[PDB]
RNA sequence: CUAAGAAAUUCACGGCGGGCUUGAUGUCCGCGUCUACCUGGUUCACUGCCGUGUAGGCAG
């Protein structure tokens, strides 16, 4: 979850719903798991279901930056495409958790 | 047209003190090397000889 650095504390309260229950997908859609133990009115339930959709959906406009890479690639019989690569946060999290049980851990030690 | 394109790491210092490596010893033993012959290399391409000048009798 990339975003405002001094605003990533409410993300823990929004994402604790995938801990304990199975109601992480109950806050935005399927608010029957957010009406009985939420204890808010229709304005509060609607405002929560509207504000919780702005995480997984788009946050801003699709763009790039001058400090990005944006390589060129020659085409087979044409000009070029600009290739702007990105950092695989999901893949590096998966390989990082994969290697922390392979270098140390219970069985590997 | 390259994870393209850009960049000052700076500075300082006590490692220090001590000390028994000891003792012993059999290297023994044997043997056929064998035959063969022409330097006056020019031990300076000439020493030393009547004129230091280009012709000459000598130890040849």
Swiss-Prot record:
Its subunit composition reads: Interacts directly with Csy2; part of the Csy ribonucleoprotein complex with a probable stoichiometry of Csy1(1),Csy2(1),Csy3(6),Cas6/Csy4(1)-crRNA(1). A Csy3(6),Cas6/Csy4(1)-crRNA(1) subcomplex is also formed.
- Per the similarity annotation, which family is this? Belongs to the CRISPR-associated Csy1 family.
The protein's name: CRISPR-associated protein Csy1
Protein's organism:
Pseudomonas aeruginosa (strain UCBPP-PA14)
The note filed under miscellaneous reads: In this bacteria, Y.pestis-subtype CRISPRs do not confer resistance to phage DMS3 or MP22, but instead are required for DMS3 infection-dependent inhibition of biofilm formation and possibly motility.
The knockout note for this entry states: Mutants lose phage DMS3 infection-dependent inhibition of biofilm formation while there is normal biofilm formation in the absence of phage infection. Decreased production of crRNA in the presence or absence of phage. Disruption of the entire Y.pestis-subtype CRISPR region disrupts crRNA production but does not alter phage resistance (possibly OLNs PA14_33350 to PA14_33310, and the flanking CRISPR loci), indicating this CRISPR is not involved in phage resistance.
Q: What does this protein do?
A: CRISPR (clustered regularly interspaced short palindromic repeat) is an adaptive immune system that provides protection against mobile genetic elements (viruses, transposable elements and conjugative plasmids). CRISPR clusters contain sequences complementary to antecedent mobile elements and target invading nucleic acids. CRISPR clusters are transcribed and processed into CRISPR RNA (crRNA). Cas3 and Cascade participate in CRISPR interference, the third stage of CRISPR immunity (Potential). Involved in crRNA production or stability.
What stretch of the complete protein does the chain hold? 108 to 216 of 434
């Amino acid at each position: 979850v990339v975003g405002n650095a001094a605003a990533l504390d409410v993300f823990k309260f929004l994402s604790l719903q995938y801990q304990g229950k199975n109601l992480l997908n109950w806050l935005t859609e399927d608010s029957a798991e957010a009406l009985q133990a939420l204890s808010d009115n229709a304005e509060q339930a609607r405002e929560w279901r509207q504000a919780f959709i702005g995480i997984t959906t788009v946050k801003g406009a699709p763009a790039s930056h001058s400090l990005a890479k944006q390589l060129y690639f020659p085409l087979p019989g044409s000009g070029y495409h600009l290739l702007a690569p990105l950092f695989p946060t999901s893949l590096v999290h998966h390989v990082h958790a994969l290697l922390r049980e392979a270098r140390f851990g219970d069985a590997a030690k």
